């Protein structure tokens, strides 16, 4: 008989501990694995695939239309859309990125925001996208917007433009749930010159917008998502 | 002078040419291949009809109009009646296959509109009734007709609400599945190569569909002034590397 | 040290440290180079 | 590892930021393709986002309850909660369910922890000490009919005996019939016109029956069982869109009617911040 | 004194765990082993010995007669017997194979079904046995039957015919307790030409039928058999 | 047609033994080419020699 | 590691991995070859 002493914590059950256990089914042989395409190893692998952002959130019931950012022909100087960058809330929240970020407490890294244009091929347009780093207000006019991170996008044969929100930060991690100290800025978009439709054409054209994370990205300290809850256990 | 843009796919006794492609997607970066022995379980030698089943079948055409919500086809169902592919299907106990899907929609440089073409492995549909109402067989086996998401709820059928992918997930995130867009201004076809994806090496072709192909208008169709307000969309699909096993009497399936 | 005979009884696995998003982010048939035109 | 390299002004014919999303790719664009950057290192590995880590902590998967009371004159033990079964599932309490359904096929060993606590809602002199018996009943085994049937002999069926207030812990290998488990299955068990859709027999992880071994004391004692499940040795294939609407049933994808808009409406314009 | 911590599960009794224990009889010497023919090591060794199937189940109390499949002289085209292949139930259930399969939850593998003919030596017959893989109905006529796994048996000097039901399956394991998804097919038998008795002879002749497992076979995940139960403990 | 128009046609060859196809479904099950009208103005379909007998009569 | 002195006190035995059905499936005195006639 070897002398032992038990410490504080004996008998506790910590849902996060990782130890060995007896197998209830001694000697059982599991089914062989066969090959299946698509294996995922890290959630970091999947948040780099871009998905659509319901940017046009202004509706009243969920609709395919809140994915469409409208553009008006012949407007000059004006603003196309605006949003803050609380990736865990608001427009971002239902996107795959938003949806995964919510399983973690802290995030750090660059984001990739792209816009794909869908107007007739014989039209043309020049837009400016601007990222405003924390510390200033959402820009109120392009002059204000153009003094921060921006890209003049020229609509052409190449249909999409990929803007990166480079990680601009004092503190090396931000909270995924919106927090002030930790806030990330604003994203706005304005006409640089203006949309022009060809003859025989009319109305609004739309941009689709996507979001995905750069390879830069870090997420840490897992927790429970506000995105799902329940009141009684389900049954069959 | 090769462009990403022009392409030719020859499979069996049938060929497709596109002069306005946008590359092609190969699901999960894997190309269809036959079933290796190391992965095999059933001891039966399989049948590989080759060129008589691995050719291109063009399903009947759809009509995109400003009110369209989107269409959904299931595989191998959509092909249950195409030539010898279909016969083999009803006659063997088990079968396995990959596909090349080519979705076509051309317009002019004055039109606008953008379709999402996506392949969803194991797309289990939801009942519009809620609770634990099931979706009857016939409803998930529309055949070449596919399911028309702008048709009405029916009884025992699935829900046809587009912002929810027919299953409780948001349209916006379908982009995590192999997919390609058809943006009239860019593109006129979409091509996806689908490798066989299952948790068993070979399965039944009639009780289980392993992918749904979905074509969904996202930026509404907008035709030039006084143009007819609609465009046809055509889907052509070719089984590839097909194998059938466990031949016998010929399945009888509901309806 | 495993104290038990069966493999199911061992602790959690150890980090894949695999990580390859290209099956999801770039499943295109003809390779796309960043910087070269998307559609030629 | 560098998180960002140093990059300076650019005036090229080589534009990495113009792409064609119609192709289905997400081109790997970085901050340094469009602004001037400085070197910085990652200092991070992505350890805690590994799927083994993501699915590897215990989650509550089931709460049931049984009571110790005089069975004298009870015509239906099962019905008096004299004993109770549970057909194992991971899709009844939604927290873990949403996590698993981020994938199409999943393969793992399970580690179960079972906590049992007792309650004595009405006047008792004391708290008795009860031993619970949890039997693993695979499909085809005789199922208990009374709380003290021959079944409980469990001569071939794994069973664990632990005390109420304590915890029991054991681990079961991956018992799936196929190579992985399909939490989705767009099929039927056969081509029947009325057979159930979606719920299949290759997601069956067995089933479990609980009872108190003790005979009855003078008062009644409520014992409530909580089953926790931890995946170990995880393997996951084919990512899918996360669950947006609420769940209604074990094993079907169905969402409730007149549900509410899941996308938050702006308080303001598209232009609003 | 070495510091320890006890984990969840301490003190539990798992009937399937395998550990060391003190011997109550320290130093006792067991009787020597002598040699005994017949040692069994695996249940897989014994399920390969064939045993008779009470195929003729149509009686009302157990009788030697339900082991006998009758044959009629001069019938043409017709069907001799039919059964599904739920090895854990129905005809199979009392056979040694059926009886062992019931101690396990899953089975996979090939089955060997043989028929031994017992009619007068001067008679003759040609039968067809057909295996119908899952997915079709039990065949309704030989035409239907002959399109699946089959053997034309010619009754001769060699008295028995061994048909194999080769493992035809998507899923690599089936349930021993009958389940749909997991179902294995049907087995039928028909006259290929017909039984012919010699002169001076009359009546029915019978076939005996056996079942055993091929070396192919796998059984896993032990459990309790529905084949035995009790209401009070026995005594001497 | 004008350069700013577009069209997709299917040409089908039906080997001896079946009737002239009556609808595209019927037509598409034999030798066929989906032609996409583009910059490249012509499409060349080949009627590959499908035959039992190695020569046919010109009349 | 055995902690106890007696052999009865050790854990379960380890798989025979013996397996030879012929004493049960083919106890015939003159050897039968599959494919050759049963009765000559």
Swiss-Prot record, chain B:
Domain of life: Viruses
Subcellular location: Virion; Host cytoplasm
Subunit composition and interactions: Interacts with capsid protein VP1 and capsid protein VP3 in the mature capsid.
Free-text function comment from the UniProt entry: Forms an icosahedral capsid of pseudo T=3 symmetry with capsid proteins VP2 and VP3. The capsid is 300 Angstroms in diameter, composed of 60 copies of each capsid protein and enclosing the viral positive strand RNA genome.
The protein's name: Capsid protein VP2
Biological source species: Human rhinovirus 14
Residues included from the entire protein: 77 to 331 of 2179
């Amino acid at each position: 008989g070897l002398p032992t002493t038990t410490l504080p914590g004996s008998g506790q059950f910590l849902t996060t501990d990782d130890r060995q256990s007896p197998s209830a089914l001694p000697n059982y042989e599991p089914t062989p694995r066969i090959h299946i395409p698509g294996k995922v190893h890290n959630l970091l692998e999947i948040i780099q695939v871009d998905t659509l952002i319901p940017m046009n959130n202004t509706h009243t019931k969920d609709e395919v239309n809140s994915y469409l950012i409208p553009l008006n022909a012949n407007r000059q100087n004006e603003q196309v859309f605006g949003t803050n960058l609380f990736i865990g809330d608001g427009v971002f929240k239902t996107t795959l990125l938003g949806e995964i970020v919510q399983y973690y407490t802290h995030w750090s890294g660059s984001l990739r925001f792209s816009l794909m244009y869908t107007g007739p091929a014989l039209s043309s347009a020049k837009l400016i996208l601007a990222y405003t780093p924390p510390g200033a207000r959402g820009p109120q006019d392009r002059r204000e917007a153009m003094l921060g991170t921006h890209v003049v996008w020229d609509i052409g044969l190449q249909s999409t433009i990929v803007m990166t929100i480079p990680w601009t930060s004092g503190v090396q991690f931000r909270y995924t749930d919106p927090d002030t100290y930790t806030s990330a800025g604003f994203l706005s978009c304005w006409y640089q010159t203006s949309l022009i439709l060809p003859p025989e054409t009319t109305g609004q054209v739309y941009l689709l917008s996507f979001i995905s994370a750069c390879p830069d990205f870090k997420l840490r300290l897992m927790k429970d998502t506000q995105t799902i809850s329940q009141t009684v256990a389900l049954t069959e | 002078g090769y462009s990403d843009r022009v392409q030719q796919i020859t499979l069996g006794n049938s060929t497709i040419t596109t002069q306005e492609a946008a590359n092609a997607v190969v699901c999960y970066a894997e190309w269809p291949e036959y079933l290796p022995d190391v992965d095999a379980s059933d001891v039966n030698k399989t049948s590989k009809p080759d060129t008589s089943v691995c050719r291109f079948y063009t399903l009947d055409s759809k009509t995109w109009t400003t009110g369209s919500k989107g269409w959904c086809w299931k595989l191998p169902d959509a092909l249950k009646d195409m030539g010898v592919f279909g016969q083999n299907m009803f006659f063997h106990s088990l079968g396995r296959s990959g596909y090349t899907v080519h979705v076509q929609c051309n317009a002019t440089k004055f039109h606008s509109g953008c379709l999402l073409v996506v392949v969803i492995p194991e797309h289990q549909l939801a009942s519009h009734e809620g609770g634990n109402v099931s979706v009857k067989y016939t409803f998930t086996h529309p055949g070449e007709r596919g399911i028309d998401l702008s048709s009405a709820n029916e009884v025992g059928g699935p829900v046809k609400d587009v912002l929810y992918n027919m299953n409780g997930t948001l349209l916006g995130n379908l982009l995590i599945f192999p997919h390609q867009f058809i943006n009239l201004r860019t593109n006129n076809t979409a091509t996806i190569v689908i490798p066989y994806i299952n948790s068993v090496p070979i399965d039944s072709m009639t009780r289980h569909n392993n992918v749904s192909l979905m074509v969904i208008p996202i930026a509404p169709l907008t035709v030039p002034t006084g143009a007819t307000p609609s465009l046809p969309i055509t889907v052509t699909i070719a089984p590839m590397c097909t194998e059938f096993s466990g031949i016998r009497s010929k399945s009888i399936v509901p309806q | 040290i495993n104290y038990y005979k069966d493999a199911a009884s061992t602790s959690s696995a150890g980090q894949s440290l695999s990580m390859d998003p290209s099956k999801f982010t770039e499943p295109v048939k003809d390779l796309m180079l960043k910087g070269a035109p998307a559609l030629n | 590892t560098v998180a960002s390299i140093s990059s300076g002004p650019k005036h090229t014919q080589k534009v990495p930021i113009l792409t064609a999303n119609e192709t289905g790719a997400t081109m790997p664009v970085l901050p340094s393709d469009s602004i001037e950057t400085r070197t910085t290192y990652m200092h991070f590995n992505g350890s805690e986002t590994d799927v083994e880590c993501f699915l590897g902590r215990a989650a509550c998967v089931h709460v049931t309850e049984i009571q110790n009371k005089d069975a004298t004159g009870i015509d239906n033990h099962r019905e008096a909660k004299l004993f109770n079964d549970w057909k194992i599932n991971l899709s009844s309490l939604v927290q873990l369910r949403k996590k698993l359904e981020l994938f199409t096929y999943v393969r793992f060993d399970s580690e179960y922890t079972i906590l049992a606590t007792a309650s004595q809602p009405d006047s008792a002199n004391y708290s008795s000490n009860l031993v619970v018996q949890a039997m693993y009943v695979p499909p085809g085994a005789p199922n208990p009919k009374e709380w003290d049937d021959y079944t409980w002999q469990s001569a071939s069926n794994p069973s664990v005996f632990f005390k109420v207030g304590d915890t029991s812990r054991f681990s079961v290998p991956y018992v799936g019939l196929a190579s992985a488990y399909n939490y989705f299955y767009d099929g039927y068990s056969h081509d029947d016109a009325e057979t159930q859709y979606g719920i299949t027999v290759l997601n069956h992880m067995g089933s479990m029956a609980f009872r108190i071994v003790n005979e009855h004391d003078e008062h009644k004692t409520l014992v409530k069982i909580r089953v926790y499940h931890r995946a170990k040795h995880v393997e996951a294939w084919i990512p899918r869109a996360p669950r947006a609407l609420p769940y209604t049933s074990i094993g079907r994808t169905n969402y409730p009617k007149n549900t509410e808009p899941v996308i938050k409406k702006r308080k303001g314009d598209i232009k609003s911040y």
